Design a protein around this ligand. Structure first.
Ligand SMILES: *Cc1c(COP(=O)(O)O)cnc(C)c1O
Ligand SMILES: *Cc1c(COP(=O)(O)O)cnc(C)c1O
Ligand SMILES: [Cl-]
Ligand SMILES: [Cl-]
Ligand SMILES: [Cl-]
Ligand SMILES: [Cl-]
Ligand SMILES: [Mg+2]
Ligand SMILES: [Mg+2]
Ligand SMILES: [Mg+2]
Ligand SMILES: [Mg+2]
Ligand SMILES: [Mg+2]
Lengths: 358, 355
């Protein structure tokens, strides 16, 4: 028995993988793998377009937004965003809700003026700040948020209404886990490898008229305009990763889309949070209740010996990935879209038995 | 029958793909796909390291070089290189031998002073320039070359001895198609999708001591050197597939063995051109002919199109020349089998006979 709670890359839906396996050598009757095709072939172009069209349908992306498939991870977006929008005289304004927020801010600092609109750093990132706390500037180039703080296990419940500057979000660890009002945002980005399949592609949803203009001085590959104009085919795309993304999106659609996956995600999170909350303090969640993530459940036992013993027992029992991020310790159960509910049931049973036997 | 002459992405070895298929759902008895592993897992780290190790073995890469696995393609390397090495008061010196050389030069021009050491652009990139012609500067940051000019079908036969600045090569379309003396270079880079693997990873071989205040973290070579290409999430499946391809090259006997195969493949196509009494004409001067991309045309555009149509009908994929130049291009990277080249010859001979 294996229970895959990996935090990134992570569990994929089996039908996406079974589909890939079956056609790995002969895709679309071509007698070639999708990995062996030109990105200008009809067979690949169909995949590339269908991945865009599925994202558009599933997230209800408006027609004045474009979907980009880029290399480099979310980490490259931390620099590409300020390179394109943080112009002289303006400010990259950041809401700090975890380590990934900090990493995004650091890159902007290398390129221009920055600001902290709000932060829960002083309290170790246990919550999302109230929107009334946000300190905004008239010359903000953007306001950047991290929707799901993967290391700390906290998540935005809803999103602020920002009118003075575009709202930008790193949605790497919760994109397409629930319905989204895309028109609240100027840009959304996500490495695919948490909730959308493959590592090696980053999905960037951009309001076209904010970013389709040449930016003086910026290298060709680092301009959003390059990728918008070329439909993410300026250079050779990560064709297998985009194919796998397509397959995962087909699965999300098949299961009922964003609304259906939100229902599933709420149920399997509740299995784990109820286990914590019924444990009389034997397990302690990091997040405040009102900010608990549906995607990454972070917790500790009462001391580090017990944390070690629990994690060792989990590994013995077939659980993969439960060690917390190195920077914070404890435990982290990553329960992205494709993690099956019976893995969560199994984790509950492990947690109850370990408590009882301690 | 399908014959895959695609120019990038390209044919992969059947054993590498079959291996990937067999274990796609259960890698190394983990009951997970390699795609479902954490990149901080021992399971993935072993694969990552093995890909590096096989490259090191196969190319005989000295210990004072590091092997990086990056995202962004060779095209991102066109900017990342000058971003790291083209410092104030220095020159990015380029040898132009085709369109890919021009694209690299263009990105350096945005970031600092550039220069053209030598160029065969005036004669439509039919040859590699004589090294004795290179115009070098004391303050060169580097000398950049393109080892195989993928669109023009020309290739360096050997490499210049440069010691005033590091020699840097875009080897996208010929890396690990033959032995190399890596000590001639300060840096080699290649998108994987011609000779090494699927698209989505870029191999960068860099002299460690060669390689920056103000450069974004992801765009510093130092970041990736210090983190062993695990600073952020790597393209795990692409690196796995690279490993599988490298195991296939090793199993057939390594770089000398693949070179012999590639020389035989190329010989079949060039002999067919040369024996055709001018019905097929190669673009490249004989002395510069590529072993990786064979470029040619028929005597007029109507016949070019007729030939390409017939090829497509008979199962050949990818033979249309690059749009910028027209004609035909047979890409015969490592994993393109000799039987496909034989088949292309036989098509070419029949086509001429029926013309
Ligand atoms: C993992 C993650 C990242 C980093 O993504 P890479 O693709 O590894 O660069 C950034 N942001 C968040 C919220 C993440 O979870
Ligand atoms: C294919 C090619 C490139 C472009 O590679 P991308 O991965 O598409 O950026 C660069 N240089 C040469 C010589 C090529 O053949
Ligand atoms: Cl975080
Ligand atoms: Cl993380
Ligand atoms: Cl070229
Ligand atoms: Cl090309
Ligand atoms: Mg369906
Ligand atoms: Mg089950
Ligand atoms: Mg030529
Ligand atoms: Mg072997
Ligand atoms: Mg002869």
């Amino acid at each position: 028995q294996v229970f895959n709670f990996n935090a990134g890359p992570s569990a994929l839906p089996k039908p996406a993988l079974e589909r890939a396996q079956k056609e790995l050598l002969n895709f679309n009757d071509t007698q070639m793998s999708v990995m062996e095709l030109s990105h200008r072939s009809q067979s690949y172009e169909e995949v590339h377009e269908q991945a865009q069209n599925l994202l558009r349908e599933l997230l209800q992306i408006p027609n004045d937004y474009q979907i980009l498939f880029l290399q480099g991870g979310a980490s490259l977006q931390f620099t590409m965003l300020p390179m394109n929008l943080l112009t002289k005289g303006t400010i990259g304004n950041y809401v700090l809700t975890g380590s990934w927020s900090e990493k995004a801010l650091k890159e902007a600092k290398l390129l221009g003026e920055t600001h902290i609109a709000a932060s829960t750093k002083a309290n170790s990132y246990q919550s999302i700040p109230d929107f009334s706390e946000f300190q905004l500037n008239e010359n903000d180039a953007y306001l950047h948020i991290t929707s799901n703080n993967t290391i700390y296990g906290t998540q935005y419940q809803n999103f602020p209404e920002i009118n003075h500057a575009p709202l930008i979000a790193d949605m790497s660890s919760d994109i397409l886990s629930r319905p989204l009002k895309v028109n609240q945002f100027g840009m959304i980005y996500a490495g695919a490898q948490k909730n959308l399949g493959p590592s090696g592609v980053t999905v960037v949803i951009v309001k076209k008229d904010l970013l389709n203009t040449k930016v003086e001085q910026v290298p060709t590959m680092l301009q959003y305009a390059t990728h918008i104009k070329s439909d993410s085919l300026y250079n050779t795309p990560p064709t297998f990763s985009i194919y796998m993304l397509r397959n995962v999106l087909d699965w999300i659609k098949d299961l009922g889309g964003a609304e259906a996956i939100a229902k599933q995600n709420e149920e399997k999170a509740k299995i784990i949070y109820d286990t914590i909350d019924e444990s009389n303090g034997f397990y302690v969640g990091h997040a405040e209740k009102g900010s608990r993530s549906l995607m990454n459940v972070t917790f500790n036992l009462r001391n580090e010996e017990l944390n070690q013993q629990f994690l060792a027992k989990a590994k013995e029992q077939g659980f993969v990935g439960l060690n917390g991020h190195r920077s914070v310790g404890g435990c982290r159960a990553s329960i992205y879209n494709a993690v099956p509910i019976d893995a969560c049931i199994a984790l509950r049973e492990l947690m109850i038995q370990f408590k009882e036997n301690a």
